[model samples]
Target: SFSGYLKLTDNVYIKNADIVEEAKKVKPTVVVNAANVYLKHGGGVAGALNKATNNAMQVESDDYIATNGPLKVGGSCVLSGHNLAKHCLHVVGPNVNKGEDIQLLKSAYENFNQHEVLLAPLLSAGIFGADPIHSLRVCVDTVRTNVYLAVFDKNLYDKLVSSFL
Candidate 1:
């Protein structure tokens, strides 16, 4: 009896929609963050980490890692979405089993310029299923040192490389 949900040719809706007829009907709304915080992650898987890292490095004006360090491990770098902020700081933390430490987070925060944005992909590379709580701790530690934090979602962020130290 019923054909189900309507499917219109792509042109019909755009051509006939009433809002389009009146330009004044659309109004600009300002978005404010009362907590002054914005968190986003998990829009994709694996690949997002690598992309975010590359972007963060470029924003900081640093060439990509030229060589690997024997005791160094890097993964899930963060990228800034806009250039309005002063700078972007990338925090490389120990593997999740090492436990989230405020000192390490603070070190990265203090080392970077204030008023700059701090970008970090999900810590631990989102591997071993790192949760939002762990991610939040790192952000909090960074913010306590007066850095604005922006992180890509764990599910969506990608990792370019990972090693045990």
Candidate 2:
């Protein structure tokens, strides 16, 4: 359930669950996809989100990217959500291979502050190579709306929970 996670603030909480599955339960206004600059819903959290929407998200992603320029690190693109939620917000985080820019990572999360209810994953913590702890911390400091952090790893979950304790 969403009840047992650590509450970093009145609006920020963490849950150890798959984001897409949890979105079915939470029904947030938006579900954030940890996307690449290309907005390609190919892999990582993007892959899971793409699958959840039955590839509808992929078509929207392609359309959005085609209309706008390539998404920059710390930039975002909003698309229609599927049955899981009402909207989907795609955020592109910094790639550590290029440089470890915490500001860019924070900017990605800062964009999240504009939304009301949202479920988000650990952006850039996987293939992009940003430290999960740093990403989580930036998320904590920047996001001001009702946001749930769907942490998929128990090890990371435990560590994050302990940090709050």
Candidate 3:
């Protein structure tokens, strides 16, 4: 709405900060958690989101799966009653053992069809050990709606800023 996802800055180039920190600081209307196909919020962005929301995500995720089958990679689910923001969008990024990183990330963003202001992270880079370059590329390219992108690793963050965003 502000600039309407125009260019580089419209999407963003965040660096050297934890996703959770920026999520709380910027306090976007929504937060997109990098999730597993099963919506199991284990490590990285998912884990932090789970912790922040007091295990609310876990319950919502399981319930979603029960009602709608396993959440497919790249698909998203919206959960309310989060401690962080108005709503949290759960997107299945990728799992090293089971899925392709970029494909899943892209799917997640493409399915992210809600809210204006959002905060998201470099998916699959942490627990799943996917390449930051690959994952962030998908993030920047696919995240059409304007949102804050947070990158924590100093070097990776710098690389993303200079090369990608």
Candidate 4:
């Protein structure tokens, strides 16, 4: 009964009442598996952050000029009160509260193919608030693939998939 692997001959479905119990029928792959989830805001903010961080750490190193006054390049660009990149050139609008942020993030995720995408949690500097979890939720609801949640939170990793049966 201890088969090292499972071979599926056809599609399978499990009802809600038997979901957990049925899962135990199979040998689990490993005691633990790595999961990755990625989250970020959309439009210009996401673009700027991606450009800055992903593309050779531009914003991280003060390479671009700030939109607001006196926030010049190569200086202490204000990202947040405790987080840098909070108020620098990558500053997002006040409308980017949880709901709106989720909406924009969902749109961004939907714009991509699930097989060719990755996700990164917008930093407190890149994001307006500290609630990266909500951001991750919005993203999981929208995306259709295996995402890479690039934040340091373990809780967010637990909720990064769609539950649709």
Candidate 5:
């Protein structure tokens, strides 16, 4: 149900697993939503999170957008952790189709560093169109230990884990 691990630094490492199931079972301090600029939890990882939380994430997203405006690329926000975790960190990753760069994606990963234990999705690689291995490398560089990067697809999981070799 899970795959390999990479050691990024003495105190920073990443492991691959099913994001939603891991979050539900592990209850990390924060779970990341590979969010859109508008905070709409409609499809991809965001949609699965919305479904897993039974619409609570959507409620939070609606309120957040109404209050804070659309999140810019690389913007992030923390929301009530509904069910999967103690908190949820919503990160807006860059759209690669727009020719956005890796720095923005790095920002998405870097923003929530304050949280010691974080569960993250492979940002922007889904509907947002980031290259999977590049996204993986960013997660390697920016994320600290205890940060779990979840990949729901097994083929991607295999590719990512082997990239370290």
Candidate 6:
């Protein structure tokens, strides 16, 4: 049942599976994207998410930003895509500027009009090279929600357990 899912902190979780598969299990209230301010879903889970929703997610993202303009490094926009979520939380990671990776990841967590179960990724790690689990501290400092890491790595898994536990 969903009753015994292992967790890091009271609300944090570590999923050991492909994100596309993992997200199905995470059943998050929000599926967050480590996106560009332009809202392009090109790499990592972003692309997978793009494929899953029949371009609806991208369409919404595109439509919103075309008028609202680019999102700030850590800012976000909401989209109506979910089986596990109430919606999507599109966020921009500091792709090359590793310096702001932490802040950007932290920023990604803020200002979600709402969230309870959030499916998300390591802001810069996939294409941006940010250490997701290591970014755990920032997550704790940033948003208050039950979070699931989309990209599951043993090193990340170990770190989240070692540090968070």
The weakest ten consecutive residues by lDDT in model 6 span 1-10
lDDT of each: 0.28, 0.82, 0.69, 0.30, 0.79, 0.67
Please, what are the lDDT tens digits per residue for candidate 2 over residues 76-145?
9788878667888889898787685757998898889889778888778877788888888788778888
Ranking by lDDT: 2, 5, 3, 6, 4, 1
Query: In terms of lDDT, which candidate is strongest?
Result: 2
TM-score of 3: 0.82
TM-score: which is higher, 1 or 4?
1
Model 2 sits at a Cα RMSD from the real structure of: 1.8
Model 4 segments more than 4 A misplaced: 1-102, 114-119, 122-126, 154-165
Largest TM-score belongs to which candidate?
2
Task: Please tell me which model should have the higher lDDT, number 3 or number 4.
Answer: 3
The pairs that clash in candidate 6 are 29-117, 124-128, 124-129, 124-130, 125-130
Worst 10 residues of 5 by lDDT: 1-10
What lDDT tens digits, residue by residue, belong to model 3 across residues 49-160? 7887789879887888888887777677787626776777887776665656556666666755466567667666777767878876776677666666666677876687
Question: Across residues 1-165, which tens digit of lDDT does each residue of candidate 5 receive?
Answer: 223555555544456566788888888788988888888888899998889999999998898889889988898888977898888898888978767776798888787577877778888887888888898778777776466677778788778777753
TM-score per prediction, in order, is 0.32, 0.91, 0.82, 0.32, 0.87, 0.79
3 or 5, which is superior by TM-score? 5
lDDT of 1 by residue, 81-112 (tens): 22222222333434344464434433332333
lDDT of 3 at 109: 67
Q: Residue 24 in model 3: shift from native, Å?
A: 2.6
- In terms of TM-score, which candidate is stronger, 1 or 3? 3
| Residue 82 displacement (Å), model 2 | 1.2
Model 4: weakest 10-residue lDDT segment is: 30-39
